Symmetry: D2
Subunit: 275 residues, 4 copies
């Protein structure tokens, strides 16, 4: 177990990637505080991991809620080693042309409050614990932080904003707190969109994400959620990532290195090389 004795706070950890990370982190011997708006899912996760996980109901948009999360983590586990600001919503790749004039202001505020302000508030709230533990922050970005067509303008802009948070916060929190980014690409989660665009009851598992990506990913297949948790384990292992700050790990199946006419260049290698 790589993370014995470590304590993480994960925002958005009641489902999706956040939950997989909760499960993974605990299995690696970490204790985990989760901040999330789903009270139901938070309790299921507490009973799933008796004594190694504590859920706090709150909204990542509220600094006070974030502070409560940090307080609760401190109260239960005595420190915070790794903050993983992870809660997010999608825009379902709604193009600028397709954003209605009378909804765009509301949609902007929703997606940016959650995706960017929620990350700032998480760090703000945990800053005393992180300086104390000489800890780290690992932000969940996305391939939409680097390339287009992973989201419309709003989502792509929020995830690029998060890259800026990686950079600025690695600077500001240095030398005491390390700040890095994992940018995963394509995950069968329960990811929602803004109620403003009528997408708040729409989950990404309901989209054929895996099949759209089949001929877009050089690796050929969209990885399972468990397969995305390793990068975070890595950044959360103190002895393994000490030199890392300002690091951005593109963790998306090769989206930035796909070819022009096909995703991959080496379909024929096995036969070409005779086994």
């Amino acid at each position: 177990m790589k993370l014995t004795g470590e304590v993480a706070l994960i925002t958005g950890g009641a489902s999706g990637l956040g939950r997989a990370l909760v499960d993974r982190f605990v299995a690696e011997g970490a204790r985990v505080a989760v901040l999330d708006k789903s009270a139901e899912r938070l309790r299921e996760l507490e009973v799933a991991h008796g004594g190694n996980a504590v859920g706090v109901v709150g909204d990542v948009r509220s600094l006070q809620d974030q502070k409560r999360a940090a307080e609760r983590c401190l109260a239960a586990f005595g420190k915070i080693d790794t903050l993983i600001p992870n809660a997010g919503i999608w825009d379902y790749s709604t193009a600028l042309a397709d954003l209605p004039e009378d909804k765009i202001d509301a949609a902007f505020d929703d997606i940016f409050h959650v995706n960017v302000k929620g990350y700032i508030h998480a760090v703000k709230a945990c800053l005393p614990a992180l300086v104390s533990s000489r800890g780290s922050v690992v932000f969940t970005i996305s391939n939409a932080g680097f390339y287009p067509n992973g989201g419309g303008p709003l989502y792509t802009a929020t995830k690029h904003a998060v890259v800026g948070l990686v950079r600025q916060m690695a600077f500001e929190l240095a030398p005491h707190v390390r700040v890095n980014g994992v940018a995963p690409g394509g995950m069968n989660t329960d990811l929602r969109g803004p109620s403003s665009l009528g997408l708040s009851e729409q989950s990404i598992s309901s989209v054929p994400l895996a099949d759209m990506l089949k001929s877009v990913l050089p690796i050929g297949r969209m990885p399972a959620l468990e397969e995305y948790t390793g990068a975070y384990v890595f950044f959360a292992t103190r002895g393994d990532s000490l030199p890392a700050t300002g690091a951005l790990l593109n963790y998306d199946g090769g989206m930035g290195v796909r070819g022009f006419l096909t995703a991959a260049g080496g379909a024929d290698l096995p036969e070409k090389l005779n086994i």
Copy 2:
């Protein structure tokens, strides 16, 4: 004159770089519409340029104001060839640790609404005109869209967000509208910050910041925008990001420039 007959719409054009841009674009034979909140400075640019500039008083955060600018530019000039969303506000380089808890949510909204939303609204308002003209968008970014310590988390995130608008809108508006970013940096102008808030002068730290070893006048940053506005010269460019900041991203560890002693080394 390289922009004869072209029409530009510039947000934040009543002062600073935006005003340098208006002036340069007018001198290149373009006709310019300007959306800015400052009535006095809009009038001031209007008298400067006669009928070659039109000012519209409004707020970049307002999609309606952005539509009025668009409509005004079309009424005045018949088309919009190049849109320069440029208005932005700074955060004074206020560190996260230094953002007061009772100020932070308001600061966030103010700087994102102006710096990111006002860019989104400009494009949205101008989209019919830009597609009709097979036009261009050129976003004013900043060094803070690429490296830290050019503002606080709020400003740095806003400018990274506009890099994201470059990339996404280049994709979405292709093949008809070209979308690119200029990332200015060596500057020295009163970039205002939010009412909810309130650093070392650039001159005081120049050799730690700019390999070019000097502080360009505002006039010297308008060329990149003219280039992107010039259809004959920038046709291949979409999704491009022009770091325009005196070499901030390629500065040395001990001093910005690596070649102070080249003249002595080469005897000249």
Copy 3:
């Protein structure tokens, strides 16, 4: 005319993009020294531009030849304002698996000597003139300097190497000489490959470059050579590019911002927006 009184030295200016740049620069009122191995093409270009262009026969791999070029430019025109190191050869996207063991060492040396060493030698040779004129260097890179599948390992590695030259030289030559990169994407030129791979008598005009790129470029069409000369004009205009050093202009039709399932996202905008 934007470049009246300016003097440029362009390596590889006897054909392709280099020649278009020679033509463009002269039409903008510049004087141009060209270093190139084709004596024939260099004379055609001298007579094309009587008094505004001077050709020097030489090999970009030879520092001494490069120095002669610089000497000749000085002798004819009195200064050097802008160096454009531009000469290059392709590898025809020959995959690592397809590089024969007994040719790879030779192919490496050929492509790297021309593409990287030729650029270093150009700058070295012109360095006294450039410091004297407070001039600039503008390197011809390629989309292969940023993304794969624009060349095999060799070519892609040489063009990434050139990005490193932009950065390191902008640093080293600061504050007296500015150093920037233009990275064009897809040009109907006479571009050759290494004799080692049997491609030295193979030109890129012989490849259906334009048609392969039709559904890869967000802009929809591969631009003509003339349409790529503007970026260089821009960097060569002193009053327009003074703040620029370390700049990399991706100038390739949108290759880095193409979508997953299609190159462009806005085919339908005209009808969608009602004109």
Copy 4:
């Protein structure tokens, strides 16, 4: 132990980071083959690890030597799961102006042959084994693959060239072999330079260089490579570039770190 049963081939593994990597990989339950020119240090690592390491004396510039390493690793261990091309030489940060005209062509060949060609040959030699194992390549890059002043033009260009090998080989070897780069930086080891050639200690300039404010031991850079070698943890990653350099790319203008006074600010 996270690498139980896996086989690594590491070039440049008899000393520095490469030797740290060998040791770490062996401690994680991997078996390692090493290509290095230094016979003495290969023997030294061989006695250190018993049959868990095999050394092959050879030159990374030689494709035949790289094939012999590959062949030796297969004979010893039956497969190759992860290839770490790591051998590289420095240029002492010799500026272009300072490269002697009678030395420059030879220096160029020496540093490119080792730093770029030896990486190409490693992959070429190991390609059948890596495709057979659905394996990984992890190139040692450097901060000089991303920012200036980490070496001269020759070293900086070589390391930028390996970023290009990351991208191209990730494309070419997909979907079977994953290709990624680690870009180490905070280090302090005798990185040798060419015979044709011949700067400030890192310690002397640390606060201008590393936001992490310390100089990690070599042991502290092996984790990233273990990660990429761990099939259960890094399956999504191809074409990835991990800046592993103490924050060199996110350093401040006046000082590397922006938060020296956070403990006082937050009272702890």
